[PDB]
Curated annotation (Swiss-Prot):
Expressed by the liver and secreted in plasma. SUPFAM superfamilies: Periplasmic binding protein-like II. The keyword Secreted applies. GO terms for biological process: antibacterial humoral response; intracellular iron ion homeostasis; iron ion transport. PROSITE patterns: TRANSFERRIN_LIKE_1 (PS00205), TRANSFERRIN_LIKE_2 (PS00206), TRANSFERRIN_LIKE_3 (PS00207), TRANSFERRIN_LIKE_4 (PS51408). Glycans are attached at residues 23, 487. The modification Dimethylated arginine is found at residue 21. The modification Phosphoserine is found at residues 364, 664. Disulfide bonds join 7-45, 17-36, 115-196, 155-171, 158-179, 168-181, 229-243, 333-595, 339-371, 349-362, 396-672, 413-636, 446-522, 470-663, 480-494, 491-505, 562-576, 614-619. It comes from the Eukaryota. Hydrogencarbonate 2 binds at residues 448, 452, 454-455. CDD domains: PBP2_transferrin_C, PBP2_transferrin_N. This is Serotransferrin. It comes from Sus scrofa (Pig).
Length: 677
């Protein structure tokens, strides 16, 4: 019924696509149909997809980046994987292949002849040229001109043969097909570049790690070839793991960002790998063809993986690679951009910005995950996170910069490491003794949010060990666990916002039961147990909180549930808690750690706890509502040195969280753990 229109770039690809079509028709009765649209290069395909004349094409990651730019706006939806299906690799190695006895090293490439897969491609172009950049003769813009003056001549398929003739000089295509961006140029692609070297049109080929073994005959003339290593030595072709230029992400199928039919694309490809995958059929091979190498998909792929929905091109490629790509394409610690979540945090941020004289700038997002993603992508620089989210951010590659401290007051606060706060379970003293730790089934729970330390990871981790199931919403009766599935019973007690409707169960300040205070309010108004930090009761009772719901509460009206079944007063969490919680911390990308840390230590020297008059001046650690930007009981931000999320959080906490990985519903976590190695 549904049709996926695949874009081909050559007569050879068109031949394979016709057989893909015919074979899928026969093998799959109801699965999407395939039809083929024949263009003459990947760039014509990207445009055909944008204009809705086609739906899909497979691209080297370097070109995924170009497809993801305006005005094309395509996104990667399915990735090739290499290697064994039980340990799929979503990267491959770029290498430089030379013939034995040619006697030159990496540092002597000047004046040689080069064979490239194609302009703008990972192994063929982006990686080798990024490495050689500093040796190219200036001016290096555009890069083509500099490359044409560095190598004596080359074959770079897809280069403009009119403006850069030397880049197309060693290519082998006839007439108008010379230097073509397709299999009509014999030296196009991995196979082509290798043939370029083989036939002595070039002295070096920039290809991938499987290229030589894939393209050499029945037996091994393989001893005739070697690899150029970056330490200026040469190694055998099967020793690429010790002689590669870089590791690069998989070729991926791309599609329209809006109305891209990706559902259809995955359904097609998934069924196709089942019937016509590696060694699956004599009638048709997805990853092979008698008409050529790497047609439609690479011959070294062994299947497909669906790309998570939150992985856009930036996330798929990774920030380092996007920066190298950006570097070759366009031809400081002045400020810290904070990521604020929602309106109240944005207003506190704005105030900070003004008071700081612009050293702090403010970027907004509607939830924690969107903030973390902005930081990873370079749209923001820092925010403070609960341990549960540090874990997620750490998987996405962010690093802890400074810790919030809660126990140490005064001048030594910044230099004192704290062990952590405590995750506890708080109940009303008035609840009968049947309410205890071993009898929570069917009870009404209040949680700070899904994926936070005290609110979720610690308690739900403990419970998972008992019930051996991720269906928490079938264990508890009804609760408020912000961030849960909207029609779950774990959203049923949530009350959203007083001003705007439809905000129930959101994991942000629109939800009145969100956060430490929030969950304590949930306990007071509706729940039986709150999963929260120690001290939340003391901080919101006996008059410290003046809001209607809290003004008459007393500390003595609450108790803690201990794991042995007993109950203790709230002043005794040290002997009645669920586990230690790592202190919340400011995270940043590895390139900004120093900058973020140094400026914040200066911010707090001006705006920290010692400010006796908050109003005339700004107070970083006090908040109009609750835990705006930092926890309200934060005494200072403290140095953590050079550490990683794993050592910051501790093996005990890492163990607990990883224990729950099967139950995770975080879309960010799913995107940040997609890639191998
Ligand atoms: C609840 O919502 C989801 C969509 O987000 C839907 O898939 C599910 O089947 C709905 N019904 C149930 C079983 O609660
Ligand atoms: Fe590639
Ligand atoms: Fe916390």
């Amino acid at each position: 019924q549904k049709t996926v229109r695949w874009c081909t770039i050559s007569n050879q690809e068109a031949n394979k696509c016709s057989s893909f079509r015919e074979n899928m028709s026969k093998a799959v009765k109801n699965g999407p149909l395939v039809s083929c649209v024949k263009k003459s290069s990947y760039l014509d395909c990207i445009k055909a997809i944008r204009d809705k004349e086609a739906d899909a094409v497979t691209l080297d990651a370097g070109l995924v980046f170009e497809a993801g730019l305006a005005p094309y706006n395509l996104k990667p939806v399915v990735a090739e994987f290499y290697g064994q299906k039980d340990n799929p690799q979503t990267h491959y190695y770029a290498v430089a292949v030379v013939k034995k006895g040619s006697n030159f090293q990496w540092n002597q490439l000047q004046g040689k002849r080069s064979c490239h897969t194609g302009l703008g491609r990972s192994a063929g172009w982006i990686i080798p040229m990024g490495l050689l950049y500093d040796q190219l003769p200036e001016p290096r813009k555009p890069i083509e001109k500099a490359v044409a003056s560095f190598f004596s001549s080359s074959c770079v398929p897809c280069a403009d043969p009119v403006n850069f003739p030397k880049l197309c000089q060693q290519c082998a295509g006839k007439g108008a097909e010379k230097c073509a961006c397709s299999n009509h140029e014999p030296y196009f692609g991995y196979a082509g570049a290798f043939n370029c070297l083989k036939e002595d049109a070039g002295d070096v080929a920039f290809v991938k790690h499987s290229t030589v073994l894939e393209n050499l005959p029945d037996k091994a003339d393989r001893d005739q070839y070697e690899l150029l290593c970056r330490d200026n030595t040469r190694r055998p072709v099967d020793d690429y793991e010790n002689c590669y230029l870089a590791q690069v992400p998989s070729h991926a199928v791309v599609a329209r960002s809006v109305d891209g039919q990706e559902d259809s694309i995955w359904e097609l490809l998934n069924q196709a790998q089942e019937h016509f995958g590696r060694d699956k059929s004599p009638d048709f091979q997805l990853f092979s063809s008698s008409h050529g190498k790497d047609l439609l998909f690479k011959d070294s792929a062994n299947g497909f993986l669906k790309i998570p929905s939150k992985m856009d091109s930036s996330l798929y490629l990774g920030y380092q690679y996007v920066t190298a790509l950006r570097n070759l394409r366009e031809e400081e610690c002045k400020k810290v951009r904070w990521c604020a979540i929602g309106h109240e945090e944005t207003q506190k941020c704005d105030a900070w910005s003004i008071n700081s004289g612009g050293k702090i700038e403010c970027v907004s997002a509607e939830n924690t995950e969107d903030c973390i993603a902005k930081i990873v992508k370079g749209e923001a620089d820092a925010m403070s996170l609960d341990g549960g989210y540090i874990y997620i951010a750490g998987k996405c590659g962010l690093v802890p910069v400074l810790a919030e401290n809660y126990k140490t007051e005064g001048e030594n606060c910044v230099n004192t490491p704290e062990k952590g706060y405590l995750a506890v379970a708080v109940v009303k003293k008035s609840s009968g003794p049947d309410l205890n730790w071993n009898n929570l089934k069917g009870k009404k729970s209040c949680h700070t949010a899904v994926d936070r330390t005290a609110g979720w990871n610690i308690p739900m981790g403990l419970l998972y060990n008992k019930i051996n199931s991720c269906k928490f919403d079938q264990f508890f009766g009804e609760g408020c666990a912000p961030g849960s599935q909207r029609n779950s019973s774990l959203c049923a007690l949530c009350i959203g916002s007083e001003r705007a409707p439809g905000r129930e169960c959101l994991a942000n300040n629109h939800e009145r039961y969100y956060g430490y205070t929030g969950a304590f309010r949930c306990l007071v108004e509706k729940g039986d147990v709150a999963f929260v930090k120690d001290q939340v009761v003391q901080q919101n009772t006996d008059g410290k909180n003046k809001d209607d719901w809290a003004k008459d509460l007393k500390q003595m009206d609450f108790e803690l549930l201990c794991q042995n079944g007993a109950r203790e007063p709230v002043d005794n969490a040290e002997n009645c808690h669920l586990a230690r919680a790592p202190n919340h911390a400011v995270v940043a990308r590895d390139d900004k750690v120093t900058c973020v840390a140094e400026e914040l230590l200066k911010q707090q020297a001006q705006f920290g706890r010692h400010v006796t008059d908050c109003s005339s001046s700004f107070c970083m650690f006090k908040s109009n509502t609750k835990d705006l930007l930092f926890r309200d009981d934060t005494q200072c931000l403290a140095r953590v040195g050079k550490t990683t999320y794993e050592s910051y959080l501790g093996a005990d906490y890492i163990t607990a969280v990883a224990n729950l990985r099967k139950c995770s519903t975080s879309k960010l976590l799913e995107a940040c753990t997609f890639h191998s190695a």
